[PDB]
């Protein structure tokens, strides 16, 4: 099982929302729908690219010659030069192809590390006020509309002002 | 009254390797090497370059009756050869420093 | 397989109050929602309210939205439906129809239904 | 809310052919939409979720198909049990749930 394989907290992800790479799902009343978090793309966007721009950009270009003609008496010439090019094609095989299975985890942990702590920081940013329905999916014991639910996706809100109704729930329960 | 954390993914084919794992699918992807040609040589530094048609470097310089096509072609950036070249020198010898001089006249102005 | 049973049907006059109980089997209620869609006689359906996990999140139509109740039983893995003040334009079968599930994410589609019951009212 | 609606309402088409009815769609809600079936004498079922996909158990001779507002469904052959009522669902955005007003297909 390939999703075994990596046994992240989120399952395969969703194809609705188009207009990100991290997201929220707020449902409420009359306020449901997709969100994008336009602070984690940008920033992880750029990152990215230059890790490959980094690596398109480097590769410095000159002139360069074919290998030459040599006649029959010279075959140390031709010898020599094959394996000078010879030792060239095999070092850049091995350099190029292991840069790119190492960078590629790096690329691929970095996404799964980008959901875990904005996943955290929704959590830190109210404790009580919420209960862990499964994966990565939270629920409001209080009522909460849009612009409510927009402090979540800012860095604001005000924990004492719904702590009371949090008391409320210690009613229901 | 729910709030999720996802992330996006579309449709796509593309696969990509790494150490963990291999034939992952992902959702964008860059390559680095290129397999495709045109199959076609290309004037390349704004000068077209000579081509050499059924004849070789020493045929053409000691003037061979044949290859009279490529006198006009003075100012180039590289020479087209063909694999067999068979009208070279007419007259049978042993051309002293051969390969020096394709060098030197690899390229002029 | 999954099997739902529905109670409760009747005569009910404007301003009363019926109970329809509503029970689940062959599937994990705990983790699962439930909501309820009526069916006027020749109209097509219109759905009234849905209830997730853990009776949290509750959900009513703006028709009835107000004046109905909703609430669920883990033990007895039931769903009821309480409500009152009867309209003379709410005779209609009112059918059981199973969330796909809590936790997930795209919501909203019904695979198991129920036969339903069958409410009228009267002058 | 959302509105929906179907349209035409009753067509008869000969058993075997193909008869196809499109419900429009305010809004776009993307590709989630979900097609019931509801045969005469009991309750509705369920044969297309994300208008892409079949349910369990289900004849593979219909067709899920559309994207946004343009919403189609299209059926290979039709027999004698295909003449039923359709219902087109959208869940996209759910306070609320709307469904369609229903088409009937029949013969003889």
């Known amino acids: 099982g390939l999703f075994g394989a990596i046994a992240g907290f989120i399952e395969g992800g969703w194809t609705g929302m188009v207009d990100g790479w991290y997201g929220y799902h707020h449902q409420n009343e009359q306020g449901s729908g997709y969100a994008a978090d336009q602070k984690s793309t940008q920033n992880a966007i750029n990152c990215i690219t230059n890790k490959v721009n980094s690596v398109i950009e480097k590769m410095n270009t000159q002139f360069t010659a074919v290998g030459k003609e040599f006649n029959k008496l010279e075959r140390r010439m031709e010898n020599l030069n094959k394996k000078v090019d010879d030792g060239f094609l095999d070092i850049w095989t091995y350099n190029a192809e292991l840069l790119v299975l190492l960078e590629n985890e790096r690329t691929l942990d970095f996404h799964d590390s980008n959901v875990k702590n904005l996943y955290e920081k929704v959590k830190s940013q109210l404790k009580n006020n919420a209960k862990e329905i499964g994966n990565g999916c939270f629920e409001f014991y209080h009522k909460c509309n849009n612009e409510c639910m927009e402090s979540v996706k800012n860095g604001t809100y005000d924990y004492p002002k719904y702590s009371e109704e949090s008391k409320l729930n210690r009613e229901k329960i | 009254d729910t709030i999720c954390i996802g992330y996006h993914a579309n449709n796509s084919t593309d696969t990509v390797d790494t150490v963990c794992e291999k034939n992952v699918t992902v959702t964008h992807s860059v390559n680095l090497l290129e397999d495709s040609h045109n199959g076609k040589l290309c004037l390349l530094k704004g000068i077209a370059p000579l081509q050499l048609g059924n004849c070789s470097v020493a045929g053409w310089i000691l003037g061979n009756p044949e290859c009279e096509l490529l006198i006009s072609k003075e100012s180039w950036s590289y020479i087209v050869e063909t694999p067999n070249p068979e009208n070279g020198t007419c007259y049978p010898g042993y051309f002293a420093d051969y390969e020096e001089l394709r060098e030197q006249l690899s390229s002029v102005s | 397989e999954v099997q739902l049973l529905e109670s409760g049907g009747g005569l009910v006059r404007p301003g009363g109050s019926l109970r329809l109980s509503c029970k689940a089997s062959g599937f994990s209620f705990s983790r699962h929602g439930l909501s309820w869609v009526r069916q006027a006689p020749g109209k097509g359906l219109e759905w009234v309210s849905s209830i997730s996990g853990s009776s949290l999140s509750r959900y009513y139509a703006d028709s009835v939205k107000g004046r109905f109740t909703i609430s669920r039983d883990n033990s007895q893995n039931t769903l009821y439906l309480q409500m009152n003040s009867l309209r003379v334009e709410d005779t209609a079968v009112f059918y059981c129809?199973?969330?796909?599930?809590?936790?997930?994410?795209?919501?909203?589609?019904?695979?198991?239904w129920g036969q339903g019951i069958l409410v009228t009212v009267s002058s | 809310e959302i509105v929906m609606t179907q349209s035409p309402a009753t067509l008869s088409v000969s058993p075997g052919d193909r008869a196809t009815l499109s419900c429009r769609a305010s809004q776009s809600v993307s590709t989630e939409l979900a097609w019931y079936q509801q045969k005469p004498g009991q309750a509705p079922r369920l044969l297309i979720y994300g208008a892409s996909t079949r349910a369990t158990d289900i004849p593979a001779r219909f067709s899920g198909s559309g994207s946004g507002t343009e919403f189609t469904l299209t059926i290979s052959s039709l027999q004698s049990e295909d003449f039923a009522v359709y219902f087109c669902?959208?869940?996209?955005?759910?306070?609320?749930?709307?469904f369609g007003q229903g088409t009937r297909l029949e013969i003889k």
């Open positions: 129809v199973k969330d796909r599930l809590d936790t997930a994410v795209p919501r909203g589609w019904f695979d198991s």
């Open positions: 669902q959208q869940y996209n955005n759910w306070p609320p749930i709307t």
